[PDB]
Amino acid sequence: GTFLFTSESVGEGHPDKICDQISDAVLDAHLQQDPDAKVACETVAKTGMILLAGEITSRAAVDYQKVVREAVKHIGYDDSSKGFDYKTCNVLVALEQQSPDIAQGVHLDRNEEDIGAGDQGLMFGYATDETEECMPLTIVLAHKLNAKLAELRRNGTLPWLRPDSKTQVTVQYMQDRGAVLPIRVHTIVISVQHDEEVCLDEMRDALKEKVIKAVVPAKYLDEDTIYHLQPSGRFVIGGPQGDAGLTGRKIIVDTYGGWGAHGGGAFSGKDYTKVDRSAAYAARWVAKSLVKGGLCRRVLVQVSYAIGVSHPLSISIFHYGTSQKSERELLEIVKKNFDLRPGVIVRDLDLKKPIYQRTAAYGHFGRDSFPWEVPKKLKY
């Protein structure tokens, strides 16, 4: 009954993640002034360049140069020696208003509760009782390894670290009637951008002793665990200089690390009317409510929409065999307890609040008691 499963995560300076954080810094800057801003901000990053492309209709006055540069500064790209510098990079803006054809079909002259979905699409939510935060251990550990790298970079413990990093964790699990039980960590990968002076052996030793051992419980590590630390051998060129980044290219890192399911939509740079984000947050809220409510040990929820239509077109449940109730009975409980119209989700999850940049690294789920992480008490 044992099996392996692998998930990855990336750091704040991974170029795709830089784009997600900038897109959400732009969204938050608009929402601080106009809670009803319509935002669809894509970011592209390559050597020396941040380009903003997309559609924004808002009453806010946003200084894009300042917002972008402050986000890059926070990430830590502040000198040409690191491959990217917020002070001197090019910031290009190609932002237009939201299409009036979309606006008239989605929200113009509509009661807020009855606003249409901002697009068609499908979205999923997942929760698992294997961790207290109801997330897969593989992705939790992968995120925490990147967070540890950023912490040691920022506190000057490992001054050779740079912001761009990737991690990957393979866990060996057992299964019990559809629920999963972590046994041990089988393999860990860490790749992190570094300065020209540090030796490979010094980095590998520090990654094992100061990063992995500070994150992963010793009970999961043994003489057979496989470590791939700086496996490329050299990672001096990094950030956008090493690899072009785009918003919405880390959608599996943002969610469940390959567990559960994904409908394809990106989260960052989008206001609540874009159901790719709001309905995925609501589906996570449903799934976590079912698991914390004791109905399931793990569960997957699908929802779907049509542009301009408020009610979901479909809702579906997969309980992995971890409920005494059938999937039909769980679906009836979901329909009795949740209203997944976007104009109701916005109110339940407070989605006009400018907290989005906080979601744009280390996963959107299983952290910080955001509204979609506070279970709803179910009536049935």
Ligand X SMILES: C[S@@+](CC[C@H](N)C(=O)[O-])C[C@H]1O[C@@H](n2cnc3c(N)ncnc32)[C@H](O)[C@@H]1O
Ligand Y SMILES: Cc1cccc(-n2c(=O)nc(N(C)C)c3ccc(Cl)cc32)c1
Q: Which residues bind ligand Y (CB under 6 A)?
A: 3, 5, 175, 180, 259, 261, 300, 302, 316-318
Q: Tokens for 46, please give them.
A: 């390559």
Q: Are 101 and 270 in contact (CB under 8 A)?
A: no
Contact region for its own copies (CB under 8 A) — 66-74, 186-194, 200-208, 288-296? 186-194
- Residue 60, binding choice from ligand X, its own copies, ligand Y, none, Cβ under 5 to 8 Å by partner class: none
Contact region for ligand X (CB under 6 A) — 101-109, 147-155, 248-256, 257-265? 101-109
CA distance linking residue 104 with residue 326, whole number of Å? 41
> In degrees rounded to 5, what are phi and psi of residue 228?
-115, 90
Q: Are 199 and 155 in contact (CB under 8 A)?
A: no
Q: Which of 75, 152, 215, 246 binds its own copies (CB under 8 A)?
A: 246
Residue 240 near ligand X by CB under 6 A: no
CA distance linking residue 170 with residue 144, whole number of Å? 14
Residues 295-324 that bind ligand X (CB under 6 A): 307
Unique residue bearing structure tokens 């939510």: 125
SS3 for 328-341, per residue?
HHHHHHHHHHCCCC
> Could you give the string, one character per residue 304-333, with x where binding to its own copies holds by CB under 8 A and - elsewhere?
x-xxxx---xxxxx---------xx-----
Q: Are 160 and 197 in contact (CB under 8 A)?
A: yes
Residues labelled catalytic: 14, 16-17, 42, 55, 166, 235, 243-244, 249-250, 270, 274, 276
Residues 22-61 that bind ligand X (CB under 6 A): 40, 55
> In degrees rounded to 5, what are phi and psi of residue 288?
-65, -35
Q: Which of 9, 14, 44, 117 binds ligand X (CB under 6 A)?
A: 14
Q: Tokens for 252, please give them.
A: 């599996």
Is residue 339 a known part of a binding site? no
Is residue 274 a known part of a binding site? yes
Instruction: Write the single-letter amino acid at 30.
Output: H
> Could you give the string, one character per residue 24-63, with x where binding to its own copies holds by CB under 8 A and - elsewhere?
----------------x-x-x-xx-x-x-xxx--------
Q: Considering CB under 6 A, how many residues would be counted as binding ligand X?
A: 21
Q: What residues form DSSP beta bridges with 38?
A: 57
Unique residue bearing structure tokens 């009661």: 111
Q: Tokens for 55, please give them.
A: 């559609």
Give the count of alpha carbons within 13 A of 61, CB side only: 0
Total length of the chain: 380
Q: Are 258 and 368 in contact (CB under 8 A)?
A: no
- Residue 14, binding choice from ligand X, its own copies, ligand Y, none, Cβ under 5 to 8 Å by partner class: ligand X
- Residue 136, binding choice from ligand Y, ligand X, its own copies, none, Cβ under 5 to 8 Å by partner class: none
Q: Which of 32, 66, 88, 100 binds its own copies (CB under 8 A)?
A: 100
Is residue 254 a known part of a binding site? no
Residues at the annotated binding site?
14, 16, 42, 55, 98, 164-166, 232-235, 243, 249-250, 266, 270, 274, 276
Give residues in contact with ligand X (CB under 6 A): 14-15, 40, 55, 98-99, 101-102, 105, 118-119, 164, 166, 191, 232, 234-235, 238, 242-243, 307
